[PDB]
Homo-oligomer: 244 residues x 3
């Protein structure tokens, strides 16, 4: 019914790793389109939204719509047995009791049957290196619980205040021709100034292994979106409402 | 009386490291033949058997038979002062109160006198990379307390079952010409299927630093033997009875 | 009033790192000459003495004498936001309430205002690799609380005794032409034999990141001095009285 092959297991390892600290139990929703996940975190503050599109697999088949009820601690114990370069295959039958995972290298075949659970179901956009976003959130987290994010045409300022004093980091808008991976770009219709939990943003930044660039999407009316491309139109997205 | 020189200290560092988690107090039995160790682990389940043959030293002299009563926590504190490439020399007199260790580089000489203690004294054979054996035992240990090992002419299957579901890893028999280090070989007189404690096998796999290949020797009547070559006919061997 | 620019932040990161385990609250005393620190450790046993000379900066300006009352846990939280190769600038006004730190790369500017506190104010010399000094102190610390340091024209012996037995490490005097970094040199007027706390010497050795050579200055009348050059005549010095 479901049969989905990744040429490399890396992507699914990294996704689950990026998410297991926020989400324990979730559903992997599989259809014609690919494999999606929508989950609030354990404290019901951050939204997690993932899509692996069918074109990300080679091949991808999902006859019928299948929700795979999965504990991500359980799932991590199985994916650790997968090497990054292992061919990974997911197999499932209709209303499955288990999900079947196979890892193929060196004439080695690993096969796991994971027991499934019953689980109930912008004003400014910043494109920058994900490592840089991770380093800033991590650094300011040592100083403050909260960070203020100011965007305008010219650059982005992350600012905070704590016991020991206060800190800012300012990244000016910059197209890097020789190394585009390093560019700071700011598509923006209106300057914005919004305050957020660093704890959640640092959790979001665990996903910097997936993409060397991150999209930070700011609105005065809807949650912050932090977004990592998984290839083509596949994505891992995090939503966090500003502190009001 | 005893005087034994290793051109490099690496081997003795790695041996003790491979063993200290199972054995605290043991005897290093020295004679004409070299330096042996036979010890049950602390829970009296696994047998440890080591031999460093006299030809492993340059030179080796042992006039009289000498049992060196040694705590391997104590001994580790001294061997950590030895660099891998240091010339290492053991010296002992008859019925010794101490063992004398010297480490020589860079015009540096380290000398230790360790206080000795009074210490009371196959159907199928698998040759494979030790790292691979370590990765499989480690991975299945996250899933299960026990692993079933099935050998036949064609390959080896390690299987297990736990809370989250069950897992298998299958390695087919394969002679690797370009990189022989990677080959899976199965000298076998009779297919065998035996269940063992993963906890002990993972402990045994600490020794994968000593040899890039490991020998897994299965019998329906005698304990499993896990075996690592230390050069020539020198060996570190582990014995573990199947779960019945 | 104070404005001091380091071409690289590395040195100030390493200094604070080398010191934070001994000293919590200290004064950075700034004048015409540069930036000094004198502090007993928390147990009032070891003296810490640092000088960054004005020529170490590019540029250095200190109109008026300024004591910067600083918690080094607080200061570490801010310096972690500085990359090793970041241009670092310290700014302060007269009787300052805060110290202003700026880190400049990649069109990135980080700026921190740290709240300041109200803080109340040889017979033989050994030149050797600092890594070697660190490896010996660390190794003997596993064995003993105390180390005896014997120097003479010919070499240096570090010796100790504990529960498990005793250990020595002997480094002979040696000029290394091809790699001078590795030489052992002993300017000496009188052989000396002195016993010291390993715990403190291992703390001192955290500073081996600053200099690949260390100066060990022994007197029968005044404290041991352990000394690391920070470039030119800039220094980090540690003083420790022998066990009597």
């Amino acid at each position: 019914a479901l049969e989905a092959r990744l040429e490399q297991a890396s992507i699914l390892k990294k996704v689950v790793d990026a998410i297991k600290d926020l989400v324990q139990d979730c559903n992997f929703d599989c259809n014609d389109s690919g494999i999606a996940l929508q989950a609030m975190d354990n404290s019901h503050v951050a939204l997690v939204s993932m899509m692996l599109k069918a074109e990300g697999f080679s091949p991808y088949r999902c006859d019928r719509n299948i929700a795979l009820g999965v504990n991500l601690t359980s799932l991590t114990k199985v994916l650790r047995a997968a090497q990054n370069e292992d061919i990974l295959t997911l197999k499932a039958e209709d209303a499955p009791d288990v999900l079947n995972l196979v890892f193929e290298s060196t004439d080695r075949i690993s096969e796991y049957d994971l027991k499934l659970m019953d689980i109930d179901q912008y004003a400014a956009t910043i494109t920058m290196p994900s490592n840089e976003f991770k380093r800033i959130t991590t650094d300011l987290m040592a100083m403050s619980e909260s960070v203020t994010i100011e965007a305008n045409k010219d650059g982005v300022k992350f600012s905070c205040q704590g016991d020991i004093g206060n800190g800012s980091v300012t990244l000016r808008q910059h197209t890097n021709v020789e190394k585009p991976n390093e560019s700071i770009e700011i598509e923006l219709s209106e300057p914005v100034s919004l305050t957020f939990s660093l704890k959640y943003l640092v959790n979001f930044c665990k996903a910097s292994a997936l993409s060397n660039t991150v999209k930070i999407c700011l609105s005065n009316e809807v949650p912050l979106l932090v977004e990592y491309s998984l290839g083509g139109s596949s994505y891992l997205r995090f939503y966090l409402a500003p502190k009001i």
